[PDB]
């Protein structure tokens, strides 16, 4: 039974001692997102913010919420070139943006750099997961800087953040990354939400999302990590939040840690090396693509990329 109005609740959140019907859950969700934003000063009221959108349940729900909160939320989708999956994610994201009035930017990896993520991985010598994340981070930051965005927002939630923290502790960062020269701020307005809560919002809002997951992350370690943390959450409501908050409040402030950033030789984006990880990756790729007749020898790639629409 809903707390506020007494209609039948459609979401029950033991970890908060809270049950809500559709209407008042949706209202609560939008408000709690803004609370997480205010708490860490993630976004100035009504400012431009670049949202990473893959069409997944998390990023679309985030686009919706930031939009309803009066932020100038512009989506940025990266066509990773992973077959039918990438095509379906593009269509969902495009459809989402057009069914509303939301401005969408798109960067196509193959059309821009010549290769998709899996081919990028094979040639570079990186695990596909690694090459994907590296490409995503570099490109969304590049677009943000080029288009004058101060901040990028991602749809990472509590399960995601708690699993990354857990994995670190098992095999031995935060909600807000500050703005630096040539480097937009990175924030995570959904980091207090469990995956179930975000998905529940997406369903109740009526958002059509891409249900299928990325083909490469089939047996990811994070899945194992999430399952153990959620096994605890089942018997102990609120454990994941206590876990993540405990690290940010009690452990990391008491934790002694160890380098200034440099403009990359090629593209001029911040890095500790002579050349950033991204250009380090593509240099090898092109060099080995040329060396294996997968790319004409008399071509040169310009680092800068233009987003369309």
């Amino acid at each position: 039974v809903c707390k506020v109005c007494g209609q039948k609740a459609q979401v029950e959140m033991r970890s908060r001692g809270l049950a809500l019907c559709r209407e008042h859950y949706l209202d609560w969700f939008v408000k709690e997102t803004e609370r997480a934003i205010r708490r860490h000063r993630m976004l100035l009221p009504g400012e431009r913010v670049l949202v990473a959108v893959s069409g997944g349940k998390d990023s679309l729900a985030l686009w919706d919420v930031l939009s309803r909160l009066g932020y100038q939320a512009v989506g940025l989708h990266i066509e990773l070139g992973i077959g039918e999956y990438s095509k379906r994610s593009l269509e969902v994201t495009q459809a989402f943006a057009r069914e509303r009035g939301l401005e969408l930017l798109v960067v196509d990896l193959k059309e821009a750099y010549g290769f998709g993520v899996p081919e990028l991985a094979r040639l570079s010598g990186r695990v596909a997961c690694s090459a994907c994340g590296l490409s995503k981070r570099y490109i969304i930051n590049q677009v943000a800087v080029e288009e004058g965005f101060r901040v990028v927002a991602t749809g990472h939630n509590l399960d995601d953040e708690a699993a990354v923290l857990f994995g670190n502790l098992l095999n031995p960062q935060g909600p807000v990354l500050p703005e630096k020269p040539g480097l937009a701020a990175r924030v995570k307005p959904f980091y207090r939400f469990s995956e179930r809560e975000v998905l529940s919002y997406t369903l109740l809002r009526g958002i059509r999302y891409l249900h299928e997951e990325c083909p490469n992350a089939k047996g990811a370690k994070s899945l194992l990590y999430k399952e153990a943390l959620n096994l605890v959450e089942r018997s102990m409501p609120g454990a994941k939040l206590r876990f993540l908050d405990g690290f940010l409040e009690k452990i990391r402030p008491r934790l002694d840690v160890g380098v200034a950033l440099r403009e990359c030789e090629r593209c001029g984006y911040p890095t500790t090396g002579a050349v950033c990880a991204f250009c380090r990756m593509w240099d090898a790729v092109y060099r080995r693509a040329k060396k294996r007749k997968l790319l004409p020898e008399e071509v040169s790639f310009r680092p800068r990329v233009k987003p369309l629409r």
Partner: protein, 69 residues
Amino acid sequence: LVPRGSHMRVVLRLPERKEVEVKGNRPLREVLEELGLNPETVVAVRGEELLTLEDEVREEDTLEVLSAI
């Protein structure tokens, strides 16, 4: 014999699709427990309604249980 038993229809999309049949006429909590599913990692949908663990599921209902992970 489940074609003749005809228990309630459950579609597992975790994320790949799968149809199973489990006995209804009991709280969702029980059928999720029987299927070895963690309630904190799924959302159970019936028609156009999210269900809660206490909600009663009948023999004729069709449940879509979506993985949130």
